[PDB]
Design a binder for this molecule. Structure first.
Ligand SMILES: Nc1ncnc2c1ncn2[C@@H]1O[C@H](COP(=O)(O)OP(=O)(O)OP(=O)(O)O)[C@@H](O)[C@H]1O
Ligand SMILES: *[C@@H]1O[C@H](CO)[C@@H](O[C@@H]2O[C@H](CO)[C@@H](O)[C@H](O)[C@H]2NC(C)=O)[C@H](O)[C@H]1NC(C)=O
Ligand SMILES: [Ca+2]
Ligand SMILES: [Ca+2]
Ligand SMILES: [Mg+2]
Lengths: 361, 255
């Protein structure tokens, strides 16, 4: 009877049981099929690998990412991901559990209907629900009005929400997020003199990104500080034990969120798309959006990012406007947490679509 | 049927990304119907996949594979990789010896083949790249691996092969009496103690091919087992030779 919560992203699946405070399973949203015929010693021929095993065996596979910019685009591979999630990761029988799934802002209705069909017809779940990721993040922060900045591995959105209603006319999408930042870090470390290009080197670069990068409050001053002293350098010990030093790359990498031109994209930065989204909303709700900017997603985890957003939005907003950025410590999982809270409410239990309803509709 | 075992020094992405060195490895592999590659240091199977891409570029089924996970007692890990031509032989079954890291630093991969072109119809190959400082004990342990294959597959026809480090300072003349794989009359040692299996200036029979079982021993073409000196074969400089590997493949033909 425990509900499951599955939050499927472009880069990572976050899955677990409703009422838990964190997802039990977090793993790459990847399906890989062997490019050649053979076996691992003591194993039979495998048709495909999903998740961590696909990443660690990727050299003899072709990898597919069934979720692109947050939207499901390969249904056969998405089914494999869900099967792996239920049977391998959570080790549950799906016909025994109501299941909450999440979807991206602006997910087409036909996509939601296909998700629902698969859950009921392929997995035989007894009930299900689909929630919008940004609305769940807002709910997790204890608010029903605010504007969510959600930035993951593949996509960044701004989603204004008014009394629990995500306003789709005002949603902004930016096709720049964590995977782009990792690639850009690889590039600029390489320019410095390092050599980071292989699959494994990308794994290390992702780790350097997550451990040493931060958002400068004043980027040009920070560049000058990095040039005048060694105070912003940080050391990082590689798997083999050799230590390297990284300087202005630490803050140049996530600067790209505010200056997408760093990777040759002509788009407004996240502060500008936040402002633009608020400005698409009725003026009478804007005070509440500016005072409730909630950040969500792995790519909002950079130290400094909330302060820099507060500064940049203050520069754009009317001069007397109260501006507040809310960046929860658990915000890499706040979509999943909002889902876990919602699915575990006695109050919620009549919002489940049951298989009987699906049979009658 | 040509079978080989080849320790390719630090076989991995850097070496397979070198077009010249990759070509030489492909040329060597192509000689064989079954080849065991050792010292595969390939954290994500990328180099293995690149080798297979080259081997299977024209006909997608030129070679099939059997590959281990990374093996070792500590952080330094290596895989065993068998490549085989599916039109010549078929893999019937595989397993990793476990009775494992107690007896071997790299637990032997064991593959059962069926083989319709040769006197022997089914035979197993046991792979070992021994830890040099433990070579006596590890080679002696292969005797127990042999018994295991016998018990598991009711099969006496077994080839044991690889870089056993079986010579020079790792196994001395007086130490052979301590190795049941040598003292038992069950086994024929096809690469003699006199052979040089190193591409470097040492003169050592490190790499070995051992055969057990009547039919298998009778399938061996007498005289065919030997190291393949690819420096000589391909008219290479010693420097190019060593950039490929510090060992030669050891090979054998079945009739
Ligand atoms: N501490 C950190 N600092 C910076 N980036 C991080 C941190 N932790 C995770 N990330 C990045 O967050 C991304 C994954 O976040 P998330 O799970 O929210 O994305 P997703 O849901 O898979 O993708 P999307 O929402 O774009 O579809 C990865 O790019 C990861 O490297
Ligand atoms: C591939 O490997 C070959 C052989 O090691 C490399 O050649 C060596 O490196 C440089 C090449 O400019 C020479 O100074 C050495 O003398 C070469 N050794 C030999 C034996 O020729 C070659 O560089 C590698 N190719 C690439 C692009 O990495
Ligand atoms: Ca997401
Ligand atoms: Ca020699
Ligand atoms: Mg000798």
């Amino acid at each position: 009877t425990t509900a499951l919560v599955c939050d499927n992203g472009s880069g990572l699946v976050k899955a677990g049981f409703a009422g838990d405070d964190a997802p039990r399973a977090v793993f790459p949203s990847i399906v890989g099929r062997p490019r050649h015929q053979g076996v691992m010693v003591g194993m039979g021929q495998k048709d495909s690998y999903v998740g961590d095993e696909a990443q660690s065996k990727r050299g003899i596979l072709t990898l597919k990412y069934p979720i692109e910019h947050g939207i499901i685009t390969n249904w056969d591979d998405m089914e494999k991901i869900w099967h792996h999630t239920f049977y391998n990761e959570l080790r549950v029988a799906p016909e025994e559990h109501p299941t909450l799934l999440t979807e991206a802002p602006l997910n087409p209705k036909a996509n939601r209907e296909k998700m629902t069909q698969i859950m009921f017809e392929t997995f035989n779940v007894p009930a299900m629900y689909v929630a919008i990721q940004a609305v769940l993040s807002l709910y997790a922060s204890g608010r029903t009005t605010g504007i969510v900045l959600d930035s993951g591995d593949g996509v960044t959105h701004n989603v204004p929400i008014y009394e629990g209603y995500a306003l789709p006319h005002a949603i902004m999408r930016l096709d720049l997020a964590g995977r782009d930042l990792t690639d850009y870090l690889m590039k600029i470390l390489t320019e410095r003199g390092y050599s980071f290009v292989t699959t494994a080197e990308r794994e290390i670069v992702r780790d350097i990104k997550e451990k040493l990068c931060y958002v400068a409050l004043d980027f040009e001053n920070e560049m000058a500080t990095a040039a005048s002293s060694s105070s912003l350098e940080k050391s990082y010990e590689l798997p083999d034990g050799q230590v390297i030093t990284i300087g202005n790359e630490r803050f140049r990498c996530p600067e790209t969120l505010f200056q997408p031109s760093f990777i040759g994209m002509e788009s407004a930065g996240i502060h500008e798309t936040t402002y633009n989204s608020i400005m698409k909303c009725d003026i009478d709700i804007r005070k509440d959006l500016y005072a409730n900017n909630v950040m969500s997603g792995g790519t909002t985890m950079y130290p400094g990012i909330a302060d820099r957003m507060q500064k940049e939005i203050t520069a754009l907003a009317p001069s007397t406007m109260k501006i507040k950025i809310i960046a929860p410590p658990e915000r890499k999982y706040s979509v999943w947490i909002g889902g876990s809270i919602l699915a575990s409410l006695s109050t919620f239990q009549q919002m489940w679509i049951t298989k009987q309803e699906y049979d009658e509709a | 049927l040509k079978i080989a075992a080849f320790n390719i020094r630090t076989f991995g992405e850097t070496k397979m990304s070198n077009a010249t060195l990759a070509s030489y490895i492909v040329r060597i592999v192509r000689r064989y119907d079954i080849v065991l590659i050792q010292e595969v240091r390939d954290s994500h199977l990328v180099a293995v996949g690149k080798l297979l891409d080259y081997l299977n570029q024209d006909d997608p089924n030129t070679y099939h594979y059997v590959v281990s996970e990374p093996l070792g007692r500590n952080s330094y890990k290596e895989r065993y990789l068998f490549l085989f031509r599916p039109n010549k032989v078929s893999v019937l079954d595989t397993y990793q010896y476990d009775d494992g890291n107690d007896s071997f630093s790299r637990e032997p991969a064991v593959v059962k083949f069926s083989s319709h072109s040769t006197k022997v119809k089914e035979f197993a190959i046991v792979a070992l790249h021994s830890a040099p400082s433990d070579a006596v004990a590890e080679i002696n342990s292969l005797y127990d691996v042999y018994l295991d294959v016998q018990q598991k597959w009711h099969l006496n026809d077994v080839m044991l092969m690889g870089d056993f480090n079986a010579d020079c300072s790792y196994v001395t003349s007086s130490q052979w009496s301590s190795i049941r794989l040598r003292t038992s009359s069950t086994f024929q040692w096809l690469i003699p103690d006199s052979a040089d299996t190193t591409a470097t200036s040492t003169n050592c029979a490190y790499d070995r091919i051992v055969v057990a079982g009547s039919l298998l021993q009778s399938s061996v073409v007498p005289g065919s087992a030997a190291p393949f000196d690819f420096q000589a074969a391909y008219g290479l400089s010693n420097e190019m030779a060593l950039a490929i590997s510090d060992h030669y493949p050891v090979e054998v033909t079945l009739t």
